[PDB]
Amino acid sequence: STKGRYGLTLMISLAKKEGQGCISLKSIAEENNLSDLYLEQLVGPLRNAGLIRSVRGAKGGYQLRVPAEEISAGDIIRLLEGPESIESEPPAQKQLWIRMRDAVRDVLDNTTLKYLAEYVDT
Amino acid sequence: STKGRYGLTLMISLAKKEGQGCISLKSIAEENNLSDLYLEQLVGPLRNAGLIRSVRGAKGGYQLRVPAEEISAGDIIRLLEGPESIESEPPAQKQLWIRMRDAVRDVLDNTTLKYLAEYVDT
Fold it and tell me: What total of structural domains would you count in chain A?
């Protein structure tokens, strides 16, 4: 999900600043090669779920409202993207896909935003 | 991968018959709502990898050439489908996707065709 990926990127940016004021929508959009309008569609649902909030003066400046350690990548993807069957497929194969899905869900649910923010590279 | 899914279905069918003669391409295609021509495109690569073989008389009848317990779902998917990057994505997020991919690969690689053939439902 394109929305999910970019939403996650937004949240990591905000997590990297938790408790240090705000980041402009303008700067995030620019940083990630997205239109401000497209970013707005990601912000809407995140704001409604109470994960982020705007600051009164920044004409579109944002911060985490909930601490990063309380938010999972799965939570974020679910909010933006959502929480294909072939009728001839044997039951074992259908279950295999379920097993795969569940493995992905596990990775996503057990990965916090704080964890994503503190990953060390270089 | 549509090819991968249908290829897997083909192989489960053949696995359910291992050592009991052959299944016609015609019957598999019919059983799975595919054209015989489309099935042919799946059979080609499986035959070339040595996993299945045709019988001399059946004008398109097939059997496993290698025992089901030696073949993984991953093996099958790889043969038919193959063994997207966004440059702005932070390194932690890129690694997250790798982690997800690896979890799926693990499920697929540790699932044998014999296992798929012997799944009990009802």
Answer: 1
B46: tokens are 């499986």
> Is there a contact between A119 and B91 (Cβ–Cβ < 8 Å)?
yes
User: Nearest-CA neighbor of B15 among B62, B54, B78?
Assistant: B62
With tokens 């440059």, the residue in question is: B87
For residue B9, the enclosing domain spans 1-122
List the one residue out of B76, B61, B82 whose CA is nearest residue B113.
Answer: B76
What is the spatial distance between Cα B77 and Cα A11, in angstroms, rounded to a whole number? 34
Distance from the B55 Cα atom to the nearest Cα atom in chain A, whole angstroms: 25
CA dist., res. B83 & res. A103, Å (int)? 19
Instruction: Report resolution (Å) to 1 decimal.
Output: 1.7
In this structure, which amino acid lies at residue A90? P
Interface test with A, best of B34, B75, B89, B96 (most A CBs within 10 A): B96
Our CA-based measurement puts residue B119 at a distance from the nearest CA of chain A, in whole angstroms, of: 6
d(CA B11, CA B6): 9
Asked if A5 lies within 8 A of B96 by C-beta distance, the reply is no
- Which helix (DSSP H) or strand (DSSP E) does residue B50 occupy? none
Experimentally, the structure was elucidated by: X-ray
Burial class (CB in 10 A: 0-12, 13-18, 19+), A5: buried
Whole-number Å distance between alpha carbons of B107 and A102 = 10
Partner-chain residue, chosen from A33, A88, A90, that has the shortest CB–CB distance to B88: A33
